[model samples]
Target: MFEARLVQGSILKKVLEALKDLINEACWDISSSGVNLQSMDSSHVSLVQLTLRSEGFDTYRCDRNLAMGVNLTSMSKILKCAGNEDIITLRAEDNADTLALVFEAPNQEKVSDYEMKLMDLDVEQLGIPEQEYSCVVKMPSGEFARICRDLSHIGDAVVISCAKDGVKFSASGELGNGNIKLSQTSEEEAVTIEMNEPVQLTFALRYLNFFTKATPLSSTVTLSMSADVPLVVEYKIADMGHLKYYLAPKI
Candidate 1:
């Protein structure tokens, strides 16, 4: 039997929310320090890595490092019943098969609990090289979301070309084409600021949507890419915890 509690409920909620879009469930590695998960999406086009430290909680205690592979859809459904500020406690019947999720409201007047079945999943981390990128861009999450949303309307794929001058996000289809270019000084309506660097790459629109789901949780989104490597989208949750998503390009 295993059990643990967190003072902040939304931390898990947000983490699960971000994963549900790409994966049905995930194996969670929980320790005394915190919780962590890193896996690629079903299509193998994108990956998600997340870590939430114990300091983000009011109380955290675990006997050992337990791996719980949970159904993300069910977990997310249960979390929907909780408020943003709710306190949460999680318990498992065994070290590997099932878990109980409980949420306590701020006033302690309301509580919710859910029992989720664990699945056996073979999750592997993709081998991503640790090399310096050619171009890196930082912008407001909303702006990036808007660019992705608008470009997706024209095509199923996006060509993210970056250069020393700036970056260009473009998409083309049978209907027409749409593009957004940003530089150090181009005052485009969507881009708040543009960085001049040496990274450029292209990725599918489908994968971009999955990675951008966490935008609501962060103020800014950073993109790091190169001509051949995958595109990296980073969401900063706190000083210690962050959400890093990687997407493999089609070209």
Candidate 2:
């Protein structure tokens, strides 16, 4: 059996809304520690990783490890009925073929339950390699989303350059070029940069815009980049886990 309860169930809704457009189906791995999900975009152009720690939940239990395959769109629809402040409980019997969700209003006046059929998905987990990034930039998520959206007006590709001065996003096409630079700031809404060395790479703005769907999940987004490696875009969930997107640089 596996059961997990959360006080702020709306977070799950945001997570689903973030991934549903990019991933149609995925497997949610359940263990004593928490829940994990890793999947590639339908076109295989990008990958997404999610980790939810059990300690972050109100109550979590797992009698055994299991993987629950689900269609994200289906689960997302069920979650739509839940109010933002509702309490959410997820339950599944050992080797169960279905997953159950219970939502309770904060005031205890209303309750809703949903059952979703689980599919058998064949997913081979990929081990993410660990390496220090040449540059890691942390900035306001809304800012990142805006930049990606703004630059897409000029070109489909964005050149991200990081240096001591700041991080620059440049794009060019028949419409000409557009560039936006952000320097490090002192406090709240600050754009901070950590660099072992400077690095600049080009990526598809199309996917970056898609990644911005997670902007609501966090106040800030982190960009980890290297010379010839996939960029890592991460949004940290409040005291719980993270939603990370991996996108390979465009040639």
Q: Which numbered prediction scores highest in TM-score against the true structure?
A: 2
In order of appearance, the predictions have TM-scores of 0.86, 0.98
All candidates' lDDT scores?
0.76, 0.93
State the lDDT of candidate 2 residue by residue for 74-113, as single tens digits.
9999999999999999999986899999999999989999
Poorly placed runs, candidate 1 (over 4 Å): 1-4, 93-96, 126-129, 185-197
- Estimate, for each residue in 167-246, the C-alpha lDDT of model 1 and write its tens digit: 78898999999889866544323333333455545678887887788986778888877666777898888555889998
**Clashing residue pairs, candidate 1?**
134-198, 134-199, 135-198, 135-199
Q: Under the 3 Å rule for N, CA and C atoms, how many clashes does model 2 have?
A: 0
Model 1: what TM-score? 0.86
Among residues 3 or more apart in sequence or in different chains, the pairs in candidate 2 whose N, CA or C atoms overlap within 3 Å are none
Model 1 global lDDT (CA atoms, 0 to 1): 0.76
